[PDB]
């Protein structure tokens, strides 16, 4: 009832740190591989009563390339997150001058809240995650190959080399589990490197949609 709760919180935090590291955010090795007992020491082992509260689990990382390009990770307390909570988090992001966030909900998120997450995109790119899908890092699965977000220079080089348009590459949905893991939007290309039994290695490129 409680030991499993802190176990889930630690696992979610571990997946979030791996996710931020894969997105290119500055994550120390110490928190990247944090043992469960270390998590209990740093946050507690009684989340039910309030040690740790999910508001204490909030993460704030900075991109390696730009220290000003930071990102939040919020852990709302309510299972079904409402529009008022989204407004509160957006208000906090405005105060701290942060433009990216992840919201790790427990049960879900209301339709109004999702519509709010969709409409104000050009201002704040804040994403929605279920705690159920952060208990595992899907990129470690054997079926999932190596995904790599290409830069606009790399995409231009690719289209110039193979002499093709973006609509001629294979596609990946914007709502794909791995696309959501890497936080990639439409127009971006992801390079997938997978092993091939006929060639050894194979690189394919999927455009986000």
């Amino acid at each position: 009832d409680d030991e499993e709760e802190t176990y889930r919180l630690w696992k979610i935090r571990k997946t979030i740190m791996q996710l931020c590291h894969d997105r290119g955010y500055l994550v120390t090795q110490d928190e990247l591989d944090q043992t469960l007992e270390e998590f209990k020491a740093q946050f507690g082992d009684k989340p039910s009563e309030g040690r740790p509260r999910r508001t204490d689990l909030t993460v704030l990382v900075a991109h390696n390339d730009d220290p000003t390009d930071q990102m939040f990770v919020f852990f709302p307390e309510e299972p079904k997150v409402g529009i008022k909570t989204i407004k509160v988090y957006c208000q906090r992001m405005q105060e701290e001058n942060i433009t990216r966030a992840l919201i790790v909900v427990q049960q879900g998120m209301t339709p109004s809240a999702k519509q709010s997450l969709v409409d104000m995109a050009p201002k704040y790119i804040l994403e929605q995650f279920l705690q159920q899908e952060l208990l595992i890092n899907i990129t470690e699965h054997e079926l999932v190959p190596e995904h790599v977000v290409m830069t606009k220079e790399e995409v231009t080089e690719l289209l110039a080399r193979y002499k093709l348009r973006e609509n001629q590459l294979p596609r990946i949905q914007a709502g794909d589990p791995v696309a959501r893991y890497f936080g990639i939007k439409r127009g971006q290309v992801v390079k997938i490197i997978r092993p091939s039994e006929t060639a050894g290695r194979y690189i394919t490129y999927r455009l986000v949609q």
Binding site: L26, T28, D30, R53, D56, T58, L60, A62, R92, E96
Partner: protein, 40 residues
Amino acid sequence: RQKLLKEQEEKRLREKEEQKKLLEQRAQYVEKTKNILMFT
């Protein structure tokens, strides 16, 4: 054996870079805790 010594001291340099990165993450975490404090 001299090349062994060069590779050994190279490993020492790399571990020292590990330590300098660790203290760099400490130097940014001491900033991040005040933001986490005013968060909740």
